[PDB]
Each structure stands twice: as structure tokens, then as C-alpha cells.
Design a protein around this ligand. Structure first.
Ligand code: CU
Lengths: 224, 224
């Protein structure tokens, strides 16, 4: 399973979104290198201008590419579920605003890792930080706390994303995560640990479509 | 589940590994199929730079499972009956007074996605012919695909001639010889004689810098 990740893996991502009735579709393509915990991806909104800020979509848009140091290999649920993959479900509570509910299927199809997701958002304020497009185009570093979920043969994750707002304030998004293996087969169930993340967002200056270029480094830690 | 996999909209992921007269290329397609209305909506990207052949010559190669079979013809839908394990689709395409394509594809589900992964080999094409010379119009005519059962090989065969408009007003013919065999083993539907009637419309994405083809297609089965 971790065998599928010894080198560079091409990635396809597709997000079917609905936020307060506003419908959008995003496609991403690029590559992940789990030996160094690196993701390089470009996303396009194929439906025109997004109704939500790009940074609110970052956590939704493949943690199998986290670098798990050698002494932590037995704790890497994400890779062990491959190639059949895992379902990743989240509820994201934007503080003083609406919620995202996401379901994604992450698997291999031949040589590509594929992440297909539907996202539904409700209860957002039309003049809030999200529909009012008031979030800075950057992304902070976080700790994704992972715990085993033996009942469901998977894992759970909890973490709070901090979104910088244009006026200097911070928009919190509380993430509640569950992953379940898709196929029957042994999976690694981890002890408590976290993923430490870093993300940098840029633009293609010759790209006229609404888009986000992303580079991300992730390392598992919290086990000495 | 056979036809049951096609009651809604189904995401598609196609891949074509091609070699024509030694000129190598790779095409990746994504989009959606809706077999209830016989609709295909796809976008193709040549990842290897400009194609050495015209896009319209690749159209038939790049999922007849999304053909609309009317209720009273459902018993003759081989393509859906082989799902999710899928079928191998092999073709020989004879371009009159020119070279030949030989193709082999596996069409199957990968989770939620219908996947069409193809190898194409082209030989004996003329340097200043309509194909290598890029003399074909960017469009696609409507055809009838005649399907017949193939008892021994537990599959089907199909025969038809594609008509490619040439820039000078002439017409380039391409005789298709097709065989489909199920991958699983794996009870399937062997149809009476009938046909697929097709319409295809080809377009461009004005913001896409890579060589590409946007495709919309309607196909309905008839003859019974
Ligand atoms: Cu897809």
C-alpha cells in the first residue's frame, strides 16, 4: 500500500460544490511526492468565478501524500488503504457563519491518485467573510490531530483552520473528520499523532480562468 | 449491478497512449456521461504537446455504455451488462488510401468513475495525407454503429464507416472494425442486431492553452 507511494504520483481532483444554492465545479491536477511530503497542484473553477474564497476549499481539495518518517510508518492509515482507498468525510463549522459538509472518495485508478468530493454548504451569511469574499489569499500552517477509530476500522481527525481576514481579524473553521477504508483488507490503525502542514497559494499570471496554484508540505509527527 | 450503475450522471476518466508512425502522444479526458439521455460531456487535453494527428480521428477511440437504450431494448445493452468489471474494446480503423489505427481499450469502473484506458498504434500513414497533413475539418458527422452478437467470444462486434470532412470539401473515410469482450466471467447480454445512432459536436475552450478538444455527444440505440 505504502508501496504505491515510493515515487512521484500524478493526481486528479474534482469537487462538485453547492454553497447556499450557489453551484460550482473545481478540477485539480498535479503530483504528490510522499517521500518528501510534497503536493504541487493547479485548480480551475470550470464554472466561472467561485462563490466562496479559494482558501475555504483548500482542506477539502489527499493526506496519503503526507511524509510519515520511517519510525512512524505503522501509523500511516492513509497509504495502507490504497489502492482501493478511503472515504473522507468532514463537517466544517465556520465560526459565526455557515457549515461545509464534504464527502470524498480517494483512490488509485491505474497510475493516478483520484480525489472526488461532493461539497454542500448551508447557513452562510451573504455579507460574511466567506460569501463576502473577505479572506486573504494565503493559508496558515496547522496541526491535524489524528486518532484511531476502531469501530469503523478507520481514523478520525480534529483541527481548527485559521483563515486570515482582509481587515486583520481571523476566521475560524472547526474541522471534524472521519476516514473509512473503501475495500475490505487490513489497514494500519495509528496511535495519536498529528500532521504538521504548510501551504502556499499563488496565481498563474497568464491564466484567465478563476484558479488556485498550490504547493504544500506535510510531515507526520508527535511520536518521538 | 449492471444497468443499475447508469441511472444517474457518471464521471468519466479517459486515457489514450498513442503512437502514430512513431509519433508518440498522450491524451487525457474528463467529464460526465448520462445514459438516461445518451449524453456525453467531455474535455480532452493532449499532455504531450500538439497532436501529430487530427482530433477528429481520435473521437471514436476516446464509452458506448452511455448510449441511451430505450426501455424496450434494454435486453440488448451489452455495454452496461458487463459493468462494473467492464469490457475490452478492440478496433482496427482503416483510413481509405491512408494508414491504419489499431486500438485496445479497457472500459470499467474505478469506484464512482467510468474509466476508458486506451492504447493506439498507427502505421502506414502518408506524410502529406489528410491525417499527418492535418487536412481534416474540426467537426464530426452523425453515424450508425451496427452491432451484432459474438457468441463464441461472449461479446459483440460492430462495423461502421466514419466520414471525416476534409478541408477541400472531399471526404476521408475510416472503416471501423470493432470487437468487445467482457473482462469479468461474468454473465452478459448478447443483443439481437441493432444500431447506435450518433451525433457529436466538437469545440474549444478559449482559455485552454494546451492542445485540446471539448466534446458533446448524443447517442441513442435503435433498430429493434
Ligand atoms: Cu473524475
Amino acid at each position: 500500500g505504502e508501496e504505491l507511494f515510493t515515487g512521484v504520483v500524478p493526481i486528479l481532483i474534482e469537487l462538485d460544490g453547492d454553497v447556499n444554492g450557489h453551484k460550482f465545479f473545481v478540477r485539480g491536477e498535479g503530483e504528490g511526492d510522499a517521500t518528501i511530503g510534497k503536493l504541487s497542484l493547479k485548480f480551475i473553477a470550470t464554472t466561472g468565478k467561485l462563490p466562496v474564497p479559494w482558501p475555504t476549499l483548500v482542506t477539502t481539495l489527499v493526506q496519503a501524500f503526507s511524509r510519515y518518517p520511517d519510525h512512524m510508518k505503522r501509523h500511516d492509515f492513509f497509504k495502507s488503504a490504497m489502492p482501493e482507498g478511503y472515504v473522507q468525510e468532514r463537517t466544517i463549522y465556520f465560526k459565526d457563519d455557515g457549515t461545509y459538509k464534504t464527502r470524498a472518495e480517494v483512490k488509485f485508478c491505474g497510475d493516478h491518485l483520484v480525489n472526488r468530493i461532493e461539497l454542500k454548504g448551508i447557513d452562510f451569511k451573504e455579507d460574511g467573510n466567506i460569501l463576502g469574499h473577505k479572506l486573504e489569499y494565503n493559508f496558515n500552517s496547522h496541526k491535524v490531530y489524528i486518532t484511531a477509530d476502531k469501530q469503523n476500522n478507520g481514523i478520525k481527525a480534529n483541527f481548527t483552520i485559521r483563515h486570515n481576514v482582509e481587515d486583520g481579524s481571523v476566521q475560524l473553521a472547526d474541522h471534524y473528520q472521519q476516514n473509512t477504508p473503501i475495500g475490505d483488507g487490513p489497514v494500519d490503525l495509528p496511535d495519536d499523532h498529528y500532521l504538521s502542514t504548510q501551504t502556499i497559494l499563488s496565481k498563474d499570471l497568464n491564466e484567465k480562468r478563476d484558479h488556485m496554484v498550490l504547493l504544500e508540505y506535510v510531515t507526520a509527527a508527535g511520536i518521538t
